[PDB]
Structures are given as structure tokens and as C-alpha cells.
Amino acid sequence: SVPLLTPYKMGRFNLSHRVVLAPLTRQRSYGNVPQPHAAIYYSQRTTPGGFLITEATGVSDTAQGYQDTPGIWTKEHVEAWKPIVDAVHAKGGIFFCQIWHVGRVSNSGFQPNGKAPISCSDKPLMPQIRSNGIDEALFTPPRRLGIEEIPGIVNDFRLAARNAMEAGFDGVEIHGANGYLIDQFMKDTVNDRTDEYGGSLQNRCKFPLEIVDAVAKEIGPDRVGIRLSPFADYMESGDTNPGALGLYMAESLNKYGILYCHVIEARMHTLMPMRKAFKGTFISAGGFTREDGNEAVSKGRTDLVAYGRWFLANPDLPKRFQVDAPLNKYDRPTFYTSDPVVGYTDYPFLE
Numbered sequence: 001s002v003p004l005l006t007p008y009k010m011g012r013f014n015l016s017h018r019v020v021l022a023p024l025t026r027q028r029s030y031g032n033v034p035q036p037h038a039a040i041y042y043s044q045r046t047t048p049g050g051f052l053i054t055e056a057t058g059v060s061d062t063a064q065g066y067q068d069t070p071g072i073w074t075k076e077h078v079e080a081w082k083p084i085v086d087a088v089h090a091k092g093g094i095f096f097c098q099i100w101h102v103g104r105v106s107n108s109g110f111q112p113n114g115k116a117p118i119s120c121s122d123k124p125l126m127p128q129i130r131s132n133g134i135d136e137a138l139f140t141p142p143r144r145l146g147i148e149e150i151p152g153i154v155n156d157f158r159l160a161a162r163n164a165m166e167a168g169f170d171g172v173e174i175h176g177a178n179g180y181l182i183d184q185f186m187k188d189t190v191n192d193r194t195d196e197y198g199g200s201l202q203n204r205c206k207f208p209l210e211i212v213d214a215v216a217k218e219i220g221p222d223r224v225g226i227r228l229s230p231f232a233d234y235m236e237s238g239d240t241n242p243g244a245l246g247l248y249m250a251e252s253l254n255k256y257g258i259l260y261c262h263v264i265e266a267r268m269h270t271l272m273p274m275r276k277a278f279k280g281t282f283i284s285a286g287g288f289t290r291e292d293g294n295e296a297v298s299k300g301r302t303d304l305v306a307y308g309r310w311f312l313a314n315p316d317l318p319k320r321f322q323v324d325a326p327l328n329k330y331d332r333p334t335f336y337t338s339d340p341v342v343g344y345t346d347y348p349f350l351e
């Protein structure tokens with residue numbers, strides 16, 4: 001009866017409902033290592049046939065810009081993620097690992113040898129902001145990547161995709177949104193390169209398309225999604241022509257025949273052109289209510305809807321939605337704190 005709670009077939013996966021766990025950075029993977037507490041967390045949010053996306057997961061030793069976000073670039077990361085994946089599988093979840101590199105959204109304190117964060121350009125991020133006291137930028141201005149270094153970062157994503165499979169994930173979500181490394185190349189206010197990776201829409205999408213290319217070759221395009229936010233400007237990532245960026249990307253990922261395109265809504269024409277252009281599954285995110293999502297599903301505006309904050313705060317979100325029970329309030333001050341339990345796995349199920 002309830003459109004959000006109607007099954008849906010995502011390529012070769014059968015989903016019981018359309019209520020997806022959005023990727024949610026929780027900063028509790030000590031030392032970039034996934035922790036057994038995450039096994040409880042994602043397990044609590046699993047339903048048979050539910051689709052879950054992990055928090056963003058680093059592709060390399062320089063992919064990090066916050067403390068305690070997990071990697072999947074070492075054999076060690078692989079082994080620690082296995083029991084988390086298995087717990088999700090035990091309750092019948094389809095579980096995709098979202099893979100990112102923060103690029104310029106970082107500092108020397110997060111980089112090996114204390115070196116500069118890397119980006120498509122050397123454009124400094126929030127220059128008005130310094131750390132407590134020192135006249136020193138909070139976001140250590142980034143090093144512009146040599147074109148000789150770009151294939152060996154695009155390979156970093158190919159390899160993280162490989163290690164996701166090793167850990168047993170069903171698939172991978174490429175984090176091409178929110179002002180991080182992939183979005184940095186795509187956005188015209190950030191990418192001012194005068195080589196083949198910059199200086200034009202096509203040049204600017206070369207990077208993401210190379211990444212999609214290498215991941216889908218590694219693991220199969222049928223296990224590959226990408227997240228885009230062409231309309232956002234998180235971390236100074238706005239585009240002067242966001243409708244064009246969006247359409248060119250959605251159109252351009254058709255060639256590759258990947259599984260899904262997952263897009264964050266603007267401040268609300270926008271998502272539709274991308275949806276009609278992209279032939280596979282479409283996932284919409286950003287400020288959905290139950291009723292917003294029921295409506296988007298029934299009117300064919302999207303196939304799935306990712307909920308981030310409400311799902312964070314309600315381990316049984318899909319059930320609650322099935323029934324319209326009241327939701328737990330989300331406690332913002334513990335989104336990003338570092339306790340294994342508090343504001344992480346102590347949001348309650350329905351009495």
C-alpha cells in the first residue's frame with residue numbers, strides 16, 4: 001500500500017522497500033580502522049532486502065580530511081570490515097561501500113609526512129577560517145596535481161572497489177559529491193586546470209568518468225553507483241552552471257551502464273533532467289520526509305530515497321514509515337563525536 005514500502009528491483013538486487021540508509025560519516029573508525037561497534041550500528045539498520053550505504057570510506061593514505069573515518073585501502077581495513085558486512089548480510093541487507101577521497105577538504109595534520117592536501121587545483125578552501133589561535137589556515141592550501149599523478153589516483157578508487165569486494169560488500173558507491181576530490185574536478189569554481197583534466201565541462205568530467213570506468217571494470221558496472229550533488233556548494237563547491245554539469249554527467253554515465261545514480265536535491269527544475277537522462281536506478285536524497293518520499297516514488301520522480309538524519313536516529317526507520325509511527329529526534333551534537341555507543345547505537349527501536 002505505502003509507495004516507499006513497495007519492493008523494487010535494482011538491476012540484479014531485490015529490494016524489499018525503497019528506504020535506503022544514506023552514507024553517513026560518523027568518525028568512529030579509530031585510526032581509519034572499522035570498529036566492531038559499526039557491526040551493531042549497521043546491523044540495527046538492516047532489514048531483509050533493505051539497501052544500506054556506508055559512511056564514506058577512504059581510498060588511500062591521503063584520502064582523509066577528518067579524524068577516525070574508515071579506509072578500505074589496506075589488507076587490515078578489509079579484514080576489519082568483514083564482520084560488519086557479515087552482520088548486515090545475516091539480516092539480509094544489500095550493502096554498498098561508499099568510497100571517497102576528500103581532496104582539498106583536509107589538512108597537513110591528516111596527510112602523510114605532513115604534506116599538503118591534494119586537489120585538481122591549488123585553490124584554497126575557506127581562507128577566512130584559521131584553527132584556534134594560530135594565523136594558520138584550517139584548510140591547508142592544496143597542491144595542484146601533476147597530470148602524471150592522476151591515473152595513480154583513479155587507480156586508487158579502482159583498488160578500493162576491489163577491496164570492498166574482498167570484504168564482501170555487494171557493491172560500491174563512488175563519492176562524487178559534497179565538495180570532495182571528485183566534485184573538486186567537476187566544479188568550475190574549483191577546477192581552473194589548463195590541461196586535459198580542466199578548463200572545460202568535458203575536461204572537468206574526465207576525472208569522475210575515468211573513476212567510474214576503472215571501478216566498473218574492476219567489479220562489474222552492475223555493482224556500481226555514483227553520488228553527485230551538482231546543485232550544492234558545500235565546502236565552496238558551487239558550479240556556475242549546475243544544470244549542465246548535472247545533465248552531462250547523467251547522460252555520460254549511460255555509456256557505462258552502471259547500476260545507479262544517486263543525487264542530492266538542491267534548495268527544495270533540477271533532478272528530473274538527470275533522472276530522464278539516466279536509464280538505470282535513480283536515488284534521490286536531501287530533506288525527504290516520509291510523505292515527500294511516498295510522493296516521489298508514486299509519481300516516478302525517483303526509484304529510491306536515501307534518508308540520512310532520520311535513519312541515523314531511528315534504526316527501524318523503514319518499519320516506522322510502514323506504519324507512520326513517530327520518529328526519534330536526531331541529536332546533532334553526537335553525529336560526529338567519538339563514543340562507540342553514545343548517539344551511535346542507543347537510538348531506540350519501537351517499544
Ligand SMILES: Cc1cc2nc3c(=O)[nH]c(=O)nc-3n(C[C@H](O)[C@H](O)[C@H](O)COP(=O)(O)O)c2cc1C
Nearest residue numbers: 022023024025055056285286287288307308309335
Ligand atoms: C552526520 C552526517 C554525515 C554525513 N556523511 C556523508 C558521507 O559520508 N557521504 C555522503 O555522501 N553524504 C554524507 N551525509 C549526507 C547524507 O548522506 C544526506 O544526503 C543528508 O543528511 C541529507 O539527507 P537527510 O535530509 O535525510 O538527512 C552526511 C550527513 C550527516 C548528517
